[PDB]
Every structure is written in structure tokens, then in C-alpha cells.
Design a binder for this molecule. Structure first.
Ligand SMILES: NC(=O)c1ccc[n+]([C@@H]2O[C@H](COP(=O)([O-])OP(=O)(O)OC[C@H]3O[C@@H](n4cnc5c(N)ncnc54)[C@H](O)[C@@H]3O)[C@@H](O)[C@H]2O)c1
Ligand SMILES: NC(=O)c1ccc[n+]([C@@H]2O[C@H](COP(=O)([O-])OP(=O)(O)OC[C@H]3O[C@@H](n4cnc5c(N)ncnc54)[C@H](O)[C@@H]3O)[C@@H](O)[C@H]2O)c1
Ligand SMILES: N[C@@H](Cc1c[nH]c[nH+]1)C(=O)O
Ligand SMILES: CC(C)N(O)C(=O)C(=O)O
Ligand SMILES: CC(C)N(O)C(=O)C(=O)O
Ligand SMILES: [Mg+2]
Ligand SMILES: [Mg+2]
Ligand SMILES: [Mg+2]
Ligand SMILES: [Mg+2]
Ligand SMILES: [Mg+2]
Ligand SMILES: [Mg+2]
Ligand SMILES: [Mg+2]
Ligand SMILES: [Mg+2]
Ligand SMILES: [Mg+2]
Ligand SMILES: [Mg+2]
Lengths: 322, 335
């Protein structure tokens, strides 16, 4: 693992970076980069509501073609499924020999949806964390960790560039791991599906539903299953499972060892393997891309089911009172 | 309603401020109830065994510390914060004789009263202030001007103001800032046991662990499996806690959000769901309680064999190495 002493800030401080997109990653990358003394511009479409926001934040904003053309390093921070079209229409023609094409997820390059020219660097700085937090931890004096990867080293100093960039975005604070595009792609898809988003949300929803279905009030279930999760994860994050388990009661600790493997069971472990299998062999990526080409249809249905769930409406009420 | 969440305007701070509180024990909950109540202007003493090494810790925090018998003797409100399993003995040997007519006996969880392991006398209030969080964070959030939510319960209203006392107690430990719910001792016992089992401790920890292991077992370095499955979890949960799942899902990429919907029902599957209902049955019928008490009477045999194992697991040794390198941990160490 690499830290501040292992990277050279001046490298990215001397390059012009163009952030394409201003969504979850884009704003954090853009703002952290500017705060770090980097010359940044954000490349957006005409009619994008965030144009003014990015501007009020104190950034130069221009269209995508101009940002691409002006930039030494061009970081694609738009949804993975729209990167091939966006690359070809607004990026590709602005790439000069010696330029760096950069990503925060190796998905497109790794599965072959985008094949950059042979005469540019192709790197990734993948923060292991949601963009709002990539930004917040950076402003708090901490930083989200990154994988640094180099798929094509056209200039011979792509490593110094990807590592100075991680420094730019807070990575050296908590740690940078050198990885390949294959490795980031695979571990990232797995984490968000198995544990961080799929596993977690559905675990909380399942326990909330078990209680409400058994006649406990939804308000009670939200405090127990959902609100309190933050506090438990906080202790682990700072001091480990051994500290958290010490904090809780021996009743709760016993209950953990006894109930954990019934809830996260041998089938859930096989599911995790199968999830990774489908990541590895490209069939999940094909499924997602298909759904995207079908107008996010399955994504939108499932979004509406979660958004209208009692855990979400009850939670919205309770939090409005804090 | 069903239910009415209550806040600072529903409670009267002066009530608990007018009573002497004896906190018996100084562990997770102990230190948090004791310090938040002292900060809220309450007359607090900590009750500990003679020669306990936490006595200096409590005294270092500026609290009055004395032996348990004296604490219980002096107190109007006797709050029991030692391990659930030792409560019947600690109570018999050191609390009961000190309870006067019109005293209040208080718990932070309903295990002992609900299941019958402790039968209190009919001349005292029997109440509960159960924070829905860990003791270190009941404390932290309070100092941050927030407060962990509380369940307020009364098994016995001896004096006719037991409710006023339990609600005021909740204010004193920060429950008013986020929400107080009135519940029965039964209700809290059952939901609490269920949360920590299914979701907050068993769920979560096995989930993170199985996540980490899946990756290591497929060949990814344990450092990366830690950043991915463990460290990042605090970030996602913070977004949910602040703003809802809808916002967390907004913050994450369409790639991740599609994967969430696709992978969720797979990892947290129909067997996971059956498991939770059986877990809830064993809680409601008292079997789970009898199993836990049996294990404590039997050398904490299962507890300690699992504790050893997860505490020395690679997720823990690797996480401890990784966290030791954080610039904010080194910054804080310097302090
Ligand atoms: N925090 C996360 O969401 C997260 C974390 C790590 C890596 N990543 C990776 O970062 C990259 C971006 O993810 P995100 O979730 O920050 O994106 P997002 O969904 O937040 O992207 C929104 C931004 O992209 C723009 N955009 C959308 N469609 C467009 C189009 N057709 N043309 C031009 N601009 C368009 C929007 O206007 C907006 O500025 C992805 O490769 C993702 O895998 C995301
Ligand atoms: N976060 C939590 O831990 C939490 C949350 C909600 C409710 N509760 C409830 O609060 C109560 C206490 O839980 P905890 O986890 O804070 O306890 P703990 O396990 O942190 O308690 C340890 C303390 O109890 C004392 N102690 C242990 N055995 C003793 C004995 N035989 N005689 C006298 N003192 C003894 C210790 O010396 C120490 O002060 C329980 O009823 C629990 O269910 C705890
Ligand atoms: N920061 C320590 C004090 C210290 C130890 N070493 C350097 N400073 C406390 O807290
Ligand atoms: C935000 C998080 C789940 N994550 O790490 C991602 O990589 C993502 O959103 O795709
Ligand atoms: C999860 C834990 C802090 N909790 O809320 C408890 O009820 C407990 O420790 O017994
Ligand atoms: Mg990720
Ligand atoms: Mg991702
Ligand atoms: Mg404890
Ligand atoms: Mg414990
Ligand atoms: Mg305690
Ligand atoms: Mg007394
Ligand atoms: Mg609890
Ligand atoms: Mg409990
Ligand atoms: Mg997003
Ligand atoms: Mg999304």
C-alpha cells in the first residue's frame, strides 16, 4: 500500500485536468483536484442543471469537446453505460499523442467497450467510496482509498501521473493500491453487489420487514434495523470487529455468532461465488448493458419498489424531525 | 397514532435532575449513561466492585465513584448496567437490600425482567431506558449535540410518576434529540434481541466477513478485500442514515445500483428470510434466552470460542494493520 511519501504532488499540479461529468464522482474529483492546486475544467452538456452548481462551486465549466481539447488528462465521470458513445462523440477527436485518458472504474476498458488509441496513456484512479464521501472525507482532512491502474503506458510516466492524481483526490491519506483494470473491475462489481449495496440494503430491508410483518411498529423497526446500523459500522470502521463486539453486550455478541451464519448462510456464500463468476466471465456486464439499451427498464422498476417501500417513507418522516 | 415519537417538548428535564442516579457498572452503556446524565445536570454516582480497574477510568472522567452497595443505598434511581447474565446475582447480592419504598429500579434492556430472571419488589418503580445504539456512540453523539434514540418502558408504576422519570431519564442521555418511543418491556426485549441478531451484529458481521472471504478465496489480496468489503461500508451506511436509500442509490453509479437490485435477493435470500423468522420465534418463546444463559453458566463456552476466532481472523489482523496507517489515526496519535 502507498501513502503520501510514495507519490509526487507536483506531477498532477503541472497537468491540466478535464473532468467529463459532474455527478457523484465528477464533483468530488473536480473539487478535490482544484483544492489540491490542480488546473481543472468540467466538461458538460448544454442544458445540464448542474452547470450553474459546478460554476457556483468556483470551477471553470465548458462543453465536453472543449474540456477534452484543453486537457492533458481527461477523466471520464459519466455513467459507465454512456461512456462509449460519449468517448466517440466528444472525447476521441480531442486526444493528442501524450494525453492521458483516465477512468474511475475499469469496466469499459476491461470488457472492451472502449479501445483507446495506442498513443495515449490509459489509467484509472478508482476511489473505494461514494463520490459525496470522496468529497467529504477530503474536506475533513481524511481521504477515500484508491486503486491506481495503468492499462497503457504510452508516455513511460503514466504511473507517476495516476499516483499524483490519487494524491489529488485524497487517496494517499488512507491508501493507494496498485491494481490492474481486470482486478479493479472484478473486485468493485463484487463489493457493490454482494456486500455494500445489494447485500446491505436487502439485509436491512429483510429485518425491517420481518419485524413489521410480526406486528412491531415500522418506526421501531427503522431505529433498530436501519438507523442504528450507522453506529455499529462506525465502531468497526475506526477500531475493528473486536472493538465493536466488545462494545455490544455479551447477549448481543452471543446472538451475533449464533444468528450471523443463519442469516448469511451457506447459500449466501454460494451466491457470492456465483456473483463473482458472472463478474469474471463478462455475463453480468452484458446483462447490465442490455438493460441500459432497454432504457434502464429493470433498474427503474426496482428503483420504484425501493423508493415506495415503507422503510423509505417511514425513514423520510423520522429523519425530517432530527 | 401507533406510534408517537416523543421529543424534547414531550419530556420534563427537571424530574431526573431532581433525583439521585446510581449507575451500577461502567462498561459500554454504564459510561455513556453516567457521563451524559452528569453533563445534563443530574446527581450521578457510579457503583463498582472494590478494586475494579475501571474505577480510576470513571474518576478520570470526573464522576463520583463508590462501591455498588453504597451507590444503590444513596440512589433514588438504580440503573442496572452490568452484563445481562450477571444481573440476577449482582441484584440479589448488592442491589435489592438497598431499595427503599418509592425508589426506581432501571434497566437499559428488558431481558431479565421480561423473562423473569429478576422479580423486583412491589414498592419500587420498574422502568427502562433502552438506547437503540452502542454505549460508545450513545456517548459520542450526545457530545456532538445529537443523541441515540431511546425506548422508554415502565413495568411497574409504583409511585405514579414512573413515566415522567423514564421520559426524563431518556432526555438526560440524549434520546429527545432523535426520538423516544414508548414500548413495553416485552416489546423492547423482543425487537432488540432480533435487531442485534438478524441485522446489526450477526447479519452485518457475517455479511462483511463472507464478502472478504469470497474475495480472498478467489485470490484478491486481503488488503483490497478489506477496502472493498469492510472500509467502504461506513460510507454507504452514512448516506442511508443521513438521507435514505433513495439518495445512497442516487450517489452510487447505475452499474452499482443495477447490481444492488440484482444481487440483494441472492445474498439475502429466502433461507435468510426463513432464518429471521425462526430467529424471531426463538426470541419470543424464550428459547434463545435459555440458550444464552446456559452458555454463560457453562464457561461462556460458545461465546469465547467464537470471540477468539473472529478476533484473530485475517479481516481483523489486516484491518488493524491497514487502519494503523491512516493519516488521521497517525494525526490523532500525535495529538
Ligand atoms: N461514487 C460512485 O458512484 C462511483 C464510485 C467509484 C467509481 N465510480 C465510477 O465513476 C464513473 C461515474 O460514476 P458516477 O456514478 O459519479 O456517475 P453519475 O451517474 O453521477 O453521472 C452523472 C454525470 O454524468 C453526466 N451525464 C449523464 N449522461 C450523460 C451523457 N449521455 N453525456 C454526457 N454527460 C452525461 C450527468 O449530466 C452528470 O454530470 C463511472 O465509471 C463509475 O463506475 C462511481
Ligand atoms: N451498547 C450496548 O452494549 C447496549 C445497548 C443497549 C442495551 N444494553 C444493555 O445494557 C446493559 C449492560 O450492557 P453493557 O454491554 O454496557 O455491559 P458491559 O458488558 O459493558 O458491562 C461491563 C461492566 O459491568 C461490570 N460487571 C461485569 N460483571 C460483573 C459482576 N459479576 N458484578 C459486578 N459488576 C460486573 C464490569 O466490572 C463493567 O463495569 C445490558 O442490560 C445490555 O443488554 C447494552
Ligand atoms: N495524542 C496523544 C498524546 C501523545 C502520544 N504521543 C504523542 N502524543 C493523546 O491523545
Ligand atoms: C459507491 C460504491 C458502492 N462504489 O464503490 C462504486 O464503485 C459504484 O458506485 O459503482
Ligand atoms: C447492537 C448493540 C449496540 N445493541 O443495540 C444492543 O442491544 C446490545 O449491545 O445488547
Ligand atoms: Mg466501488
Ligand atoms: Mg463501482
Ligand atoms: Mg459491552
Ligand atoms: Mg460483548
Ligand atoms: Mg455498562
Ligand atoms: Mg436507595
Ligand atoms: Mg439494541
Ligand atoms: Mg441488546
Ligand atoms: Mg451517481
Ligand atoms: Mg445510481
Amino acid at each position: 500500500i502507498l501513502y503520501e511519501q510514495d507519490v509526487d504532488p507536483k506531477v498532477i499540479q503541472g497537468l491540466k485536468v478535464g473532468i467529463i461529468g459532474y455527478g457523484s464522482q465528477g464533483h468530488a474529483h473536480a473539487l478535490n483536484l482544484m483544492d489540491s492546486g490542480v488546473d481543472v475544467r468540467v466538461g458538460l452538456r448544454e442544458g445540464d442543471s448542474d452547470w450553474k452548481t459546478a460554476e457556483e462551486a468556483g470551477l471553470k465549466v465548458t462543453d465536453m469537446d472543449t474540456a477534452a481539447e484543453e486537457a492533458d488528462v481527461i477523466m471520464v465521470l459519466v455513467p459507465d453505460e454512456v461512456q462509449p458513445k460519449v468517448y466517440q462523440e466528444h472525447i476521441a477527436a480531442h486526444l493528442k499523442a501524450g494525453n492521458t485518458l483516465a477512468f474511475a472504474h475499469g469496466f469499459n476498458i476491461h470488457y472492451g467497450y472502449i479501445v483507446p488509441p495506442e498513443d495515449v496513456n490509459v489509467i484509472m484512479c478508482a476511489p473505494k467510496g461514494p463520490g459525496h464521501i470522496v468529497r467529504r472525507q477530503f474536506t475533513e482532512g481524511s481521504g477515500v482509498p484508491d486503486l491506481a491502474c495503468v492499462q497503457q503506458d504510452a508516455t513511460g510516466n503514466a504511473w507517476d501521473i495516476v499516483l499524483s492524481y490519487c494524491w489529488g483526490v485524497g487517496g494517499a491519506r488512507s491508501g493507494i493500491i496498485k491494481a490492474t483494470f481486470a482486478e479493479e473491475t472484478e473486485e468493485d462489481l463484487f463489493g457493490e453487489q454482494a456486500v455494500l449495496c445489494g447485500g446491505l440494503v436487502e439485509l436491512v430491508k429483510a429485518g425491517f420487514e420481518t419485524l413489521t410483518e410480526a406486528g412491531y411498529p415500522p418506526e421501531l423497526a427503522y431505529f433498530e434495523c436501519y438507523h442504528e446500523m450507522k453506529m455499529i459500522v462506525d465502531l468497526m470502521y475506526e477500531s475493528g470487529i473486536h472493538f465493536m463486539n466488545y462494545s455490544i453486550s455479551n447477549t448481543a455478541e452471543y446472538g451475533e455468532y449464533y444468528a450471523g451464519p443463519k442469516v448469511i448462510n451457506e447459500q449466501s456464500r454460494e451466491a457470492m461465488k456465483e456473483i463473482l463468476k458472472r463478474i469474471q466471465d463478462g455475463s453480468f456486464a452484458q446483462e447490465f448493458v442490455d438493460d441500459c439499451n432497454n432504457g434502464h427498464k429493470r433498474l427503474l422498476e426496482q428503483r420504484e419498489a425501493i423508493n415506495t417501500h415503507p422503510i423509505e417513507t417511514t425513514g423520510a418522516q423520522i429523519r425530517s424531525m432530527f
